[PDB]
Every structure is written in C-alpha cells, then in structure tokens.
Design a protein around this ligand. Sequence first.
Ligand code: HEC
Ligand code: HEM
Ligand code: HEM
Ligand SMILES: CCCCCCCCCCCCO[C@@H]1O[C@H](CO)[C@@H](O[C@H]2O[C@H](CO)[C@@H](O)[C@H](O)[C@H]2O)[C@H](O)[C@H]1O
Ligand SMILES: COc1ccc2c(c1)N=C(c1cnn(Cc3ccc(OC(F)(F)F)cc3)c1)C(C)C2=O
Ligand code: FES
Lengths: 239, 74, 378, 59, 196, 64, 99
Amino acid sequence: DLELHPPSYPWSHRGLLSSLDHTSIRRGFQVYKQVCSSCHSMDYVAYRHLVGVCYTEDEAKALAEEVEVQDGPNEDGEMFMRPGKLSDYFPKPYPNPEAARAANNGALPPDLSYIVRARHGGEDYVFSLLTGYCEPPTGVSLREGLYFNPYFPGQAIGMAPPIYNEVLEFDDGTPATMSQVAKDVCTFLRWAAEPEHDHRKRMGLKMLLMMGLLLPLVYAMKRHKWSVLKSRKLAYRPP
Amino acid sequence: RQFGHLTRVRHVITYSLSPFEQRAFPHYFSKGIPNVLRRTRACILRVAPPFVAFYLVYTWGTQEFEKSKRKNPA
Amino acid sequence: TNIRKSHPLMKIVNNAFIDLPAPSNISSWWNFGSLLGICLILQILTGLFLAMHYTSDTTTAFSSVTHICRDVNYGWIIRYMHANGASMFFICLYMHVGRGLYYGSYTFLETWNIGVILLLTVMATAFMGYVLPWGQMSFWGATVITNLLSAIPYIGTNLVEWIWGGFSVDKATLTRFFAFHFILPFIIMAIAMVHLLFLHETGSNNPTGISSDVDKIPFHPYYTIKDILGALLLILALMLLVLFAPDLLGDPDNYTPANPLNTPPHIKPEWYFLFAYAILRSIPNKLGGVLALAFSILILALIPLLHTSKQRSMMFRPLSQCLFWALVADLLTLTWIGGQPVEHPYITIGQLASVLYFLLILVLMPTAGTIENKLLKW
Amino acid sequence: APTLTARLYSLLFRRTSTFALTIVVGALFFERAFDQGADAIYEHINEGKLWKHIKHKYE
Amino acid sequence: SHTDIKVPDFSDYRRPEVLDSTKSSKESSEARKGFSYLVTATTTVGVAYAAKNVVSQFVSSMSASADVLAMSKIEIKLSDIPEGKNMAFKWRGKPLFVRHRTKKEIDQEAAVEVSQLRDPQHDLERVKKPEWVILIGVCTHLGCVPIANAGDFGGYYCPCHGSHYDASGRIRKGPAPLNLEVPSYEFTSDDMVIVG
Amino acid sequence: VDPLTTVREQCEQLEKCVKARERLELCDERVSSRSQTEEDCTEELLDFLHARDHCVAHKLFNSL
Amino acid sequence: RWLEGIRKWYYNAAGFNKLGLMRDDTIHENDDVKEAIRRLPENLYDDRVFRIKRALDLSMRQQILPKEQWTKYEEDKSYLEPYLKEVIRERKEREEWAK
Ligand code: HEC
Ligand code: HEM
Ligand code: HEM
Ligand SMILES: CCCCCCCCCCCCO[C@@H]1O[C@H](CO)[C@@H](O[C@H]2O[C@H](CO)[C@@H](O)[C@H](O)[C@H]2O)[C@H](O)[C@H]1O
Ligand SMILES: COc1ccc2c(c1)N=C(c1cnn(Cc3ccc(OC(F)(F)F)cc3)c1)C(C)C2=O
Ligand code: FES
C-alpha cells in the first residue's frame, strides 16, 4: 500500500487569469457521450448547460432530441417515453445503483459530475489514471476483473482501460490519440465540476485591480488623519 | 468615563500641525527601512527559533512516514 | 448642545463609537475585534441568502447546495463566500485570543470569560454548518465527534441518541442541525453586545500594558479610518480565496454525497478544530481523550488565575515572549498532526506536542513570570 | 496660473452638494470605462479560448 | 516666563508649498486641499462601483434561477394540429389548449353579440392569428380541466358545476365569472409558436 | 502514432530514469529467481514511473 | 552578588529603559498600587505622568529613544517602594484584625 501521486501537467487553464479552452470542452463532451455515458451517470449537467459554452442553442436541441427519456403520467395514467429537450438532464445508464453493480462485477461506477473536485489531484489525477494503465510488476496478481493502475489507491482498479488510439472520430477532425482523448475529457470534466471557472477568474482580475487602487488610497487617507499625532512634540515644563 | 474626567496631568505642552500643512509620507523609505530592520532584529530570536524547530520536526516526520512504508532488505 | 449626546439612541452610538476615549498607541492586533464583527454580519447575510434556496431533507440536501452553485444567480459566489468566510472568522478569532494572551488583556475578567463563551458558541455553530451540505466528511465527521459523548459513564449512550433523534445521524439530525445553525448566530450577536458592554467599563488595554489615561485619543476619526483600512484588507484575503482558490481550505470528500456504508480514508474535522482533534487522539483511553479535548479549550478560563508576573504585558518580558512563541509553534504542530493518519511517528509527535501544550500553560509560563520578577528585585 | 488641483477644489469640491454630484457623475463614467477596459485585458489574455471567440464557426 | 516657549521646527514634516516662512500660505491653500480631497473623492467613486456590484448580485439571487426559466416557455409545432381539433400540453404545471380554427369557426365567432356575454370581449382582440386560439385549460370558477369539442356552444364544456364555453373560449352559459385565460405569446416562423 | 509513447521513450533515456530502471530489473531477476517468497516489486516500478512521468508532464502538452 | 551579571543583562533585554521608563512605571495597577500612586508627592507623581506619556507616544510611533537618553541600570530609583510597602503592611493588619 505505497502511493504514487500525479505530476502537474501544464493545462491551458492552470494560471491565475487563464480561462478554459472551450474547443477542448466541445471535444471532451463527445468523449463522455461516445465512451463514458453507457457506464457513468452525470446527473447535474443538462442539455441546456452546454449552450453558450461549447454548443449553440440549435446544436444542443439536436443533441437532446437524440436520446430517450421517460415522462408522465398522461390522460389515461401511463408512463411513456419521449424525445429529450433542453430542460432534460443527461440520462443515467441504469435505473439504480444495485443494477449498476451487477453490470460491472460488484463495482459501482461513480457519477462524473464532480469527479475532478471529489479527487485529490483533479484533472492531473484523472489524466494520469486514464493514460497510466500498464502491465503488473513481478510478484503481483489481483482477482479476475481487476486491472493494474499505479495511480489508483491500493494499486488495483476495477475499470477496463477505457481510452485508446482512434476511440472515436472528432467533429473538428483532431487526430484522436490516447493522450489527446484524455486531455480533452479532463478539460470537460473540469467544467462539469466547476462551471463558474471563467466568470470567477474574470472577477478575480477586476478585484485585484480595484484593490490595487483602493488600498493605497485608503492607506493615504489613514496617514493624512494620523499625521497630526505622528508629527507632535511633547514638552515637560515643571516650575 | 468621558473626556474631562479621565486623569490628572500637570505641566505638559503639546505642539502639532494641521494635516493640510504637512505630508502623509515624510521620509518613508529614508527613515522607514532602517526602523523596520531595527524592529525585525529586536524580536527575531524570540519569534523565529520555535518556527525553525517546527520546520525541522515537520520535515523529519514527513519523510520518516515515507521510509517506514518502504520494504526492508530482509 | 448637540443631538448626538441628547437623543437616547444616538447617545449610545456617540459614546461607544465616536467619542469613546481610546489609547493612542494600540497596534494592528486591536483591529481583530472590529473584523470579528464584520465576519459575523457577513456570515448572517450570505447565510440568509443560502437559506432561501436550501432544504434540510436528507434526499434533497446535497442537491440543493449544488442547485445554488449551478442555477441560482451568483449563488456560487454567495456559497463560497460563506464557506471561506467561516475560515476568515476562525483566523480572526485565534489572532484576537493571541493578542489577549500576549498583552495580558485577560485581566479584564468578565470581558474575557464572555469571550470564552463566544468562542465556544462560534465553534458549535461551525460544527453544525459543515454538516448541512450532507457530503462524506459532513456525515462521517458528525458521527465520530457526536459519538464521543457516549464515553460518559451511565448516561452517555442515551445522550448521544437524544441529540441524534434516532439510532444514527439521520433525517431528524439534519433538520434540527439546520434549526440550531440558524438561531445560534443571533444568540452570538447578543452575547457579543454584552462582551462590549463590559469592555466599556474599563476601556482598552494597550501594547505597553501600562495605563493610558494620560494619552487618550477620540475613536473618530483616528480608529474609524483604521478600521476601514482593516476591513478592506479582510475583504482582500476573503476574495483571494473565493476567486482564486475556493477549495483550498476544504477537503475533496465533501463533493461526493453521504454514504452510510462507504467510509472515507482519513476522516477529520475542518482545519480550525485539528489542534484539539490531535489532543483527543493523544490519550489512548476514550473518556480520558474526551476530557482532554474539553480541557484543551476550557483552560482559557484558567489563564487569569495562572498569572504571576508583576508586569501585565509580555512587552518587557523576554523569557515569557519565547515561551509564548513556543506555544504558538506547538499549536501549529498539533494542527499538522491532527491532519495525519494514526501511525509512526505521528503518534509519538502528537503525544509529545500535547504534553508540551499543557506543560507550557500550567507550569512553564507561570515559572517564567516568577523568574522574571526575581530578576527585577520584585 | 492657479494649479489644476486648485481648479478642481474651487469648481467641484468646495460646496458639499457639488462634491456629491461629482462623485455620482464620476462613478458612471468610471464604471463603463473600468468594465470595458478590464474585459479587454481578460479576453486578450485568453485569446481564442472563449465561446465569444469561437462563436463565428457555428453561425 | 512663558515667553521662553518657542514653537519647535516642523520643516521635516511640512509640505514643500509651505516651507518658505517669508511667503503667505494662502496661495497654496487652494491647491493643498484640492489634492487631499481628490484622494477622498476618488476612493468614494471606487467604493460606489464595488458596492453597486455586491448589492446587485444579491438582488439577482432572489430572481428566477436558470431551471425556472427553463420551464418558462413551451414550443408547439403548428403543422401537428389538424384544423378543427384541439391539442393539449403541460405548461407551468397546468394544461394548455392550442386550437386551429376553421373559416366556419372564425366567421361564427366574429358576429356574436358582445353585450349578451358575461365578460364582454370581441374575438379579434382575444388573439393575433385568426386561424389560431391559445388558452389555459383551467376552468375559472373553481378549477377543472374542460373537455374539447363538446357542450351547448360547441367549444369547451365542464362536468364540475355547469359551464359552457364557445369556440373563442368565452363564457356563454354557466357559473364561471371570467373567460378562459389568454396567455402571452408570439409566432416565430410560420410553422412554430412559442408560448411564454 | 501517439505523441505520448514517443515522449515516454525520450524521457526514459535520462540518467535518473535509467538508474531507476536498473533497480527495477535487479528485483525482476531476484523475485523470479527465488521460489516461494511473498515479496514483490511494486515499489521499484513506482520509483521509475515517478521519475519518468515527471519529465513526460514537462513537454507532452506541446504536441496537443 | 553573583547573579548581578544576569540582572544587568535581563534589564536591557526587557528594554523598558529604551522608552525612558523606570521599573516602577511598568508595575501592573491593582488596588494597592492605585493607593500607592495616590500617596505620591507632587514632584514624583508628575514625573511618572510624563515618563508614561513619553513612552506611550514612542509606542505609538514604533520607535525608541537615542541610546544616550536610555534609563541606566544603576540610575533606576525604586521610587514607589516605601509607599507601596506600607499600603500592603496596612492591609495585612486589617485582614489580621478581621480574624
Ligand atoms: C465498461 C465500464 C467502464 C467504462 C467504459 C469506463 N468506466 Fe470509469 N469506472 C468504471 C468502474 C467499474 C469504476 C470503479 C473502479 C473501482 O472502484 O475499482 C470506474 C471508476 C472511474 C473513476 C474513479 C477513479 C477513482 O479515483 O476512484 C474515474 C475518474 C472514471 N471511472 C472515469 C472514466 C472516464 C473519463 C471514462 C472514459 C472516457 C471511463 N471512466 C470509462 C467503469 C467504466
Ligand atoms: C464573536 C467573537 C468576538 C467578537 C465579535 C469580539 C468583539 C470584540 C471587540 C469589537 C473588541 C474591542 C476591539 C479589540 O480590542 O479587538 C473586543 C475586545 C476584547 N475581546 Fe473580544 N470578541 C470576540 C471574541 C473574543 C474571545 C474569544 C475572547 C477571548 C477568549 C475575547 C476577549 C476580548 C478581550 C480580552 C478584549 C479586550 C482587548 C483589549 O482591550 O486589549 N473576545 N472584542
Ligand atoms: C457564526 C456564523 C456562521 C458560521 C460560522 C457558519 C458556518 C457554516 C459553514 C462552515 C457551513 C458549511 C459551508 C460549506 O461547506 O458549504 C455553513 C453552511 C450553511 N450555513 Fe452557515 N454559518 C454561520 C451563520 C449562518 C446563518 C446566520 C445562516 C442562515 C440564516 C446560515 C446558513 C447556512 C446554510 C443554509 C448553509 C448550507 C449551504 C452551504 O453549504 O453553503 N449560516 N455555515
Ligand atoms: C537516525 C535515527 C532514526 C530514528 C529511529 C526511529 C524509528 C525507531 C523507533 C524509535 C522509538 C519510537 O517508537 C515508537 O514509540 C511510540 C511511543 O510510545 C510507540 O507508540 C506505542 O506506545 C504508545 C504508548 O503511550 C501508545 O500510545 C501507542 O498506541 C503505541 O503505538 C510506537 O509503537 C513506536 O514505534
Ligand atoms: C479597537 O478598539 C475598539 C474599541 C471599541 C469598539 C471597537 C473597537 N469596535 C467595535 C466594532 C464592532 N463592530 N465593528 C465593525 C462593524 C461591523 C458591522 C457594522 O455594521 C453597521 F451596521 F454598519 F453598524 C459596523 C461596524 C467595530 C465596537 C462596537 C466598539 O465599541
Ligand atoms: S368548477 Fe367548472 S365552472 Fe364551477
């Protein structure tokens, strides 16, 4: 039970005032859609959330219409299935957690909405996990259905290596290498966990500037009033 | 107790200037830098020694936890 | 013949805020009182706005907190202001107490004891606040900490189940924790006004520890302008966290919902309790550990009785100064050890730090005072 | 040649009423200038990264 | 004597403008106040900008969130409703009736008596497009869901108390006070309608 | 095809990496040589990967 | 005697002398000290008042006197001793009598 902690990759959003790469978010979404969304849920993200971030209103309407979702009841009192809308959330693979366990040999695949924020290391951690799958060292073997990852705690994970070269073609025609696919999906998972990212940092800059102005001004006002006392001379004149 | 009822003082003169007649930052770096060094040198080996000791007990205990979790050559 | 001294309401404002006689020489360490006030108002506002969107039902609770951060307009900036605001509070508190200890302000007995009460109530508030999101650390933290009361002989086990309102931390626990977390800040508000009411009997101590009646200045404008500058610096610290590192002072495990089966690896309270969490784990016996955790805070009530020095402030006292800064460094060590797993050598370091904490307060700093006196022919 | 600070005093700062009207006017002109200026600094720092920059590709 | 007191030298602390003891300070007084009051005035303009932002954000908090705005409007496809028949939807937790009307129903609801109605409204100002009538499917008296293409006046009828609505949605014979509710809407393209 | 496996090789030919690789190969042919001992070689692999993937991080992104 | 070396060192370490204070200026004001102060002659009292005023003004500025102006160890008169000693002697007699 030793530990190998992830290294610090130079993300395009690493700096204090650096925004998320939104074209990387557009790719990363597709990596969730094509690869993850049949195993992992992502409950807090709806189809409307994508508008003005990585897709237009018309694009996100098309993406929503593509998926099945239950709705009801109706005049006769029955639960029907309908095409999705913008107001619908991203659909869960299974109906419940107990169903999910059966499909993955006892393991329950975690919801991905906050996975960047819920793990030590964040996007640095997830990227290392996805690309770090390797063959076990000598003297090592786990029970059938448990793969070797050096970045997972306890050195053994129950997830089959999900990303490889040419896993899915991209909409903008970026060459889909394993490293490229991991980089994009992490950028998306970052935005999933923290949608505020870009606004937060815009506010940060405006705060630093206003403080840069107000702090020396108020400090000058302080010194002004106090100058009566700082300058003063005392004289003791007993008769 | 208000001003006028505080305590008894005799034969003490106080002179002062209006803040509109004077500067907010007189000799700020000139006299300020050396006064700061004086203040820092005065308290340094009261304040600093315990925090040096913390740094040492910290860095000792951290890599002792790492050594212990490694395998022993026997 | 002004209407500042005349009007029944303005009179109280004029005497406690404008024309108050203040020592000429009080340092930056006297700003923390005013800043604690700002923290309290800040928590209440942001808190009230969060309560407009939150629900205390176990199923919807975690979801409501995320709903604030995602769908409510500027709900995220409100939410992280409130969480980092709680940290800024505890920074302000420990600085405020440190000042009292070093400059011997604790001689103002009533003021001091009401302080101890205030501290304890803020602790109680913040403990129940961190439960409200209903994440892993929320649920598992509350479980272990509460369940320590079962270590009381005869009654303890009943007491725990009465606080919970069941056999574990469940639906009834979360709803009542929301009600107590709402009411308590307002009780703090009241106790804080009694705190100041006693302070205005004597007025302020200063860094010298020598009486300042010969050199008082009016609060306005001298200290009103200082307090503005201080407030501005507090806002900078808060906003630097909120806008550049909002998760830095938390724990990741509170981003996954509460699971009564799946235990987090190293369960721990929030940073400002870690010193006392380490003292608890120093003692091997459980009831012993609970009595030590209680005495680690309550010892503040003992401090004025332990005073030996003929001088009030530590300003003119070298030996005491060093022992004080030793006690500070020791507390930093207990906070570190509090965050660590129970193993070699963290066990031994923790034991040694806990012994040193009580040794410094009950034996070393009293002896140091007496040695200092006999060096001055006193 | 009455200095510029002196002009500012006689024309804006002497009557408290004009001092306050100055602050209200100034705050309007400051807000628009500061916001426009600071946003430019941010969007140049993050050139081609934002939805605002990549919008044209899908319209 | 008290004449032995002479005021200490304040040269080190003075502003440059008031250093010369043989010149009158009165020239520089206009300026010296100007500078210091500018600092105060600048500070206030800055604080104004900040406080405006903090306040206005908190006000925004209490206004409708993104998910409430998501259910605000509902889109309906006009080629999906056959001329003559009614079609119902769920909107702000309540039924919503859209009805394509025939040239028979247009002319028959045009020349109705305006005074005889309990709630006097002409048809041309209840709706925009003549071939289309949009209404909330809630009975105005005590809240039911009216059944389409039925009743005496050939429009909507209620089996709760005894109300009869015409093809334009107006009350003709019953206990209901006001006519069926006309929501706020606009046609987008000739094929689509957005209600809300 | 992947920029990743190119860079993993480039970094592997550093003295800190190759010294750690040799350490890995010593217990490779030390656990395998011995029969019936519960001791394995996880530690040595992680030592290697730590040194390798630190370097990989520093310049992998350039090709993305 | 032998510890006079340490007493002289401690005096300067403690450092109230750098503000132009004597030892008895630094004594914490309880009820006995209050009475002792109240019993001082005009001269001794007004001196005490000035010395403290001076120190407080220096403390306000975060400054010290020139080294020439510092209270020398040998020149530190114990001005409050005879008044304070008798104030305490008096109280202990009343406390005894009340038993
Ligand atoms: C067919 C199954 C399957 C696919 C495909 C899959 N996962 Fe998972 N995933 C799992 C299972 C099962 C676990 C739980 C493993 C465990 O706890 O040992 C898991 C765990 C994870 C974890 C948690 C690791 C931790 O620190 O505990 C992350 C992050 C994750 N998956 C992300 C992804 C991403 C990103 C993709 C694709 C781009 C993906 N998964 C594809 C089944 C899958
Ligand atoms: C909600 C928490 C608290 C608030 C709002 C508060 C408020 C204040 C304020 C405004 C002052 C005057 C300004 C100052 O000297 O800082 C003050 C002074 C004081 N407080 Fe607190 N306080 C709080 C907690 C405490 C605690 C926990 C203690 C001690 C355990 C304490 C002890 C004191 C003392 C001794 C003084 C007098 C300081 C002096 O004159 O030198 N207070 N408090
Ligand atoms: C001394 C004052 C207070 C302290 C120290 C305090 C502390 C806290 C803390 C630490 C949290 C958890 C923050 C998080 O991790 O998300 C919290 C949550 C909360 N507090 Fe407070 N609080 C205070 C006052 C108030 C008041 C007055 C209210 C309401 C009137 C309030 C309402 C809430 C609500 C609704 C939450 C849950 C939402 C959230 O998690 O952010 N609090 N509080
Ligand atoms: C270059 C020098 C290298 C330094 C050598 C460091 C490692 C060698 C061991 C040094 C001695 C410390 O050894 C350590 O002591 C502590 C303190 O009692 C023990 O702790 C044990 O006893 C205490 C007694 O109160 C119990 O509370 C605790 O439950 C138990 O674990 C550890 O089990 C032991 O591992
Ligand atoms: C340094 O020495 C002293 C001495 C005496 C006192 C003191 C400091 N600070 C006080 C104090 C209390 N809170 N604050 C900050 C503050 C918080 C909220 C607020 O809201 C309002 F609505 F505008 F009023 C205003 C101010 C300052 C008081 C009472 C006080 O008697
Ligand atoms: S309820 Fe249908 S009309 Fe009265």
